[PDB]
Symmetry: none
Subunit: 176 residues, 2 copies
C-alpha cells in the first residue's frame, strides 16, 4: 500500500504547521518553508522505493537544498537590517547551520538512493543509511522552523524604518 517514513513525515508536517500560521504574501521565507515541508513529505514517500525512485530521491534532496539556500539567504538579509543584538545573533546562528545540514542531506539522500532495490547491501547498512537520513531531515526541519520564528521577531525591530521587510500576517487560528 502506502508505506512512508513516519519520522520524516512527522517532521515535515510540523515544519508545515509552523509555516501555515503565516500568509506567504510578502514573505518569501514563509513560502520557501511551505515548499520545504512539501518536498520533505515527498521524500518520506521515496525512502521506500525501488531502483526507479533513485533519481527521484536525489532530485528531491536537491530541490530541498535549493529551498534551504533561499531561506538562509533571506534570513541573512533580514539579520543585516536587524537592530536587535540578541535576535540578530540568533538569526545569524541558523544561517550558518542550515547550509551544513542541507549539504549533508544531499550526501545522505544519495547514499540511500544507491541502496534502493539493491539486494547486495546489508540489512543493517541500509537501515543505518535511513536513520542517518531521517536524523538529518529532522535537524533541517527544526532549523527552518527556528529560522521562521527568529525572523518574525526580527521584524519587530527594523533598521532605518527603510529597506527590506518581510510581511508577517497571520492566517486566522481556529481552535481544534
Amino acid at each position: 500500500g502506502e508505506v512512508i517514513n513516519q519520522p520524516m513525515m512527522m517532521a515535515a508536517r510540523q515544519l508545515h504547521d509552523e509555516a501555515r500560521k503565516w500568509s506567504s504574501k510578502g514573505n518569501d521565507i514563509i513560502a520557501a518553508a511551505k515548499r520545504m515541508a512539501l518536498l520533505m513529505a515527498e521524500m518520506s514517500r521515496l525512502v521506500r522505493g525501488g531502483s526507479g525512485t533513485k533519481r527521484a530521491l536525489i532530485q528531491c534532496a536537491k530541490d530541498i537544498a535549493k529551498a534551504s539556500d533561499e531561506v538562509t539567504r533571506l534570513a541573512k538579509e533580514v539579520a543585516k537590517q536587524c537592530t536587535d543584538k540578541r535576535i540578530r545573533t540568533n538569526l545569524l546562528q541558523v544561517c550558518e547551520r542550515i547550509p551544513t545540514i542541507s549539504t549533508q542531506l544531499k550526501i545522505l539522500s544519495t547514499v540511500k538512493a544507491t541502496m534502493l532495490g539493491r539486494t547486495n547491501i546489508s540489512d543493517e547498512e541500509s537501515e543505518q543509511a535511513t536513520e542517518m537520513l531521517v536524523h538529518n531531515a529532522q535537524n533541517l526541519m527544526q532549523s527552518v522552523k527556528e529560522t521562521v520564528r527568529e525572523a518574525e521577531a526580527a521584524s519587530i525591530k527594523i533598521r532605518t524604518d527603510a529597506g527590506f521587510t518581510l510581511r508577517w500576517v497571520a492566517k486566522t487560528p481556529w481552535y481544534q
Copy 2:
C-alpha cells in the same frame, strides 16, 4: 487576557470549514464565503469590547453584509443557469433568506455597538442584544453554508455550457 464569543466563532469556523474544501479560483461564491467566515470570526472578538470597538463592529457588519449581497447575487445567477427544478428551487429558497438575515445583522450589531462601554444599560438588555446577534450570526453562516453546497449541486446539471458558471475544484488536501 482576551475573550471571544465562542458561539459566533464556532459558526464562523464551520462556514470556513465548508468553504476551505474548494479553490477560490473560478469560484467567487467560495471567495465571498471565505471572506465572510473571516469577518464573522473577527466579529466574535469585537462583541466583547469597549467604546473603542464600536465603529470596528459597525464596519465589520457592513462588510459581512457586502459579502452576503455578493453570495446572493452569484447564487441567483447559478440558479438561472441550472436545469434541475428541485435543485434550482432549493438554491433560490436558501439564498433568498441571506439579504434579510444580513440586514437584521446590520440592525442588531448597531444595537450592540451603541451598548459597548455603556454603563447606563441593563445587564439583561446587553445579554439579550448579544444572544440576538449570536443567533442571527449562526443563521447567516448556516444559510451561506447551505448556499455553497446547493451551488455545487446546481453546477452538475447546467445549461449546455451556455452562460458563465463556477469552477468546483477540491483543494488538494495537504499530505
